[PDB]
């Protein structure tokens with residue numbers, strides 16, 4: 001579930017490690033998702049023919065992951081409150097495309113791990129991200 | 142003064158070269174400030190004993206710098222809107238420390254320049270940033 | 283085994299992705315090793331009491347992994363030739379400390395993977411690094 | 424002219440702020456050159472049609488720049504040694520293109536400055552780099 005201490009862990013960690021280099025965190029969050037779900041690369045017509053090893057270098061990828069991280073920044077600042085409404089607002093748009101809350105849960109389940117592996121997240125922050133994913137995907141119904 | 146073209150010029154560039162690495166842009170805007178105005182380092186009590194050459198590496202410098210650009214990010218979002226009010230909302234606390242609109246002008250004026258030299262900004266965006274400085278300072282009084 | 287095409291893959295990939303940001307590659311290569319072998323943190327007296335999540339931010343870690351990557355750069359430039367002699371020269375020094383070719387093989391077995399995960403290494407480069415580890419550890423006897 | 428103190432000043436700083444991120448130092452040394460001497464961009468045929476503001480992002484710019492700093496890294500290693508000879512070893516191929524020791528002096532002279540503004544170099548190292556420029560240019564003829 002998500003308590004105010006959890007919201008603090010996630011937010012303190014976001015100012016310290018993530019907010020200052022949003023592009024770096026966005027590229028590794030999605031790179032981890034696409035090596036785990038390679039076929040989902042096909043939803044991104046602007047770069048679905050780039051091989052996996054060329055994505056971090058591809059500007060169409062970089063603009064896309066920065067568009068996502070820029071919206072997640074707004075969700076993290078809103079975790080005490082309308083974060084659930086901000087996840088909600090993107091379901092129509094993605095639904096058009098064939099992308100459900102199952103795909104979103106898959107992306108949100110990986111960021112605790114990517115933040116531990118590369119962005120110096122402590123165990124409390126990683127566990128709080130585990131909880132936040134469950135919370136934020138539930139907000140979409 | 143600002144036209145919709147100038148606000149698109151600033152916003153597109155900010156998304157392109159600044160948003161993905163807010164810490165670098167922040168470190169260099171304050172480094173060009175603190176180089177040009179070396180005595181005002183005394184105002185920054187949690188790093189006023191670091192010599193200039195040691196600041197980009199100093200953890201408290203980087204916290205300060207990112208707290209400024211994190212706010213500035215939000216006034217860029219709001220340039221055809223309440224950007225003015227967000228700048229003026231910071232004047233009474235800084236006034237209490239001896240830091241006037243003179244000071245803010247000094248900072249705001251260096252930004253175009255810093256973006257041209259290190260963050261890939263064209264002469265149109267450099268121009269828009271020179272005028273954005275004047276608007277924001279004019280809304281502060 | 284290691285052929286000249288393999289040496290080309292590793293070297294082309296090192297100029298493209300690694301040489302320009304040696305510090306970033308050095309911190310993730312060892313971070314991956316120390317999350318896999320946490321107890322080996324005890325060999326590094328200058329930072330053995332730092333928790334895992336604080337290493338990427340710790341200057342004593344950064345200086346150490348940059349000392350290692352700076353020597354590996356010299357080994358990669360030497361892969362057609364005296365690379366084996368350059369690995370050889372560090373066995374005495376590490377032997378003093380209790381660190382064998384078993385520990386070195388453990389570090390070299392992970393860099394193909396870290397380069398795929400974070401430094402855009404193609405499958406041919408990753409497989410060539412798999413071979414290079416076997417080769418370079420063998421050079422130490 | 425160079426004393427052992429000046430060579431330690433340069434080398435320690437290079438290991439500290441330059442070696443871990445050779446690409447940034449390279450991009451900015453050539454960006455300060457190409458800003459001060461904008462016509463010599465015509466010499467760089469694989470990126471001579473990119474306007475100045477687009478160069479830090481240009482892949483061929485970054486390849487060129489890193490090929491220079493990759494070599495320069497090696498002449499720093501050899502400053503109490505064959506640094507001179509390594510600089511002069513590049514004169515006949517560049518002479519063939521119309522690029523003289525005038526040109527190299529222009530580059531070498533900007534380095535201290537660039538390191539002071541963006542790479543945390545103290546006034547002693549800035550001084551050592553001003554003299555290293557003169558020595559290296561004097562060994563070239």
Ligand code: HEM
Nearest residue numbers: 040043044045046067068071072090093099103104107108
């Ligand atoms: C995990 C949180 C995610 C958020 C907040 C998010 C947000 C966004 C945003 C802000 C856009 C731009 C369009 C708009 O403003 O509505 C976008 C587009 C898109 N995203 Fe999502 N995204 C998420 C998950 C996903 C997932 C999991 C996929 C695919 C597996 C996906 C696929 C796409 C695609 C294909 C586009 C359209 C890109 C284009 O061609 O322009 N996103 N995303």
Ligand code: HEM
Nearest residue numbers: 181184185186187208209212213231234238240244245248
């Ligand atoms: C557009 C420019 C600036 C903005 C948006 C800005 C914003 C901020 C913010 C967000 C804080 C934290 C507390 C608060 O919410 O007020 C702060 C604190 C402070 N700022 Fe400003 N600032 C600006 C300019 C300056 C300048 C030019 C100086 C000094 C000449 C300055 C001096 C200080 C001081 C001394 C503190 C440090 C408080 C502490 O010791 O932690 N700032 N700034």
Ligand code: HEM
Nearest residue numbers: 322325326327328349350353354372375381385386389390
């Ligand atoms: C994989 C290739 C490795 C290379 C080329 C390498 C190279 C180096 C270098 C150049 C030094 C500095 C001392 C000197 O010049 O001899 C060093 C020190 C050290 N390395 Fe290695 N290293 C490697 C593997 C390891 C491994 C696997 C460990 C530990 C599990 C290790 C432990 C140490 C320690 C503890 C020091 C001393 C640090 C100090 O307190 O100053 N290294 N390494």
Ligand code: HEM
Nearest residue numbers: 463466467468469490491494495513516520522526527530
């Ligand atoms: C200390 C300064 C410099 C060094 C060490 C250096 C080194 C190099 C190196 C390593 C190359 C690749 C080929 C070779 O091995 O010779 C090269 C090529 C080239 N350099 Fe220099 N360079 C320096 C200064 C300059 C300057 C100041 C200019 C022009 C005003 C310049 C113009 C060129 C040109 C045009 C090429 C491009 C070849 C191609 O089109 O790929 N360089 N440089």
Ligand SMILES: [C-]#N
Nearest residue numbers: 064065067068
């Ligand atoms: C979503 N991208």
Ligand SMILES: [C-]#N
Nearest residue numbers: 205206208209
């Ligand atoms: C304002 N700092």
Ligand SMILES: [C-]#N
Nearest residue numbers: 346347349350
């Ligand atoms: C070896 N460090």
Ligand SMILES: [C-]#N
Nearest residue numbers: 487488490491
């Ligand atoms: C020389 N480029």
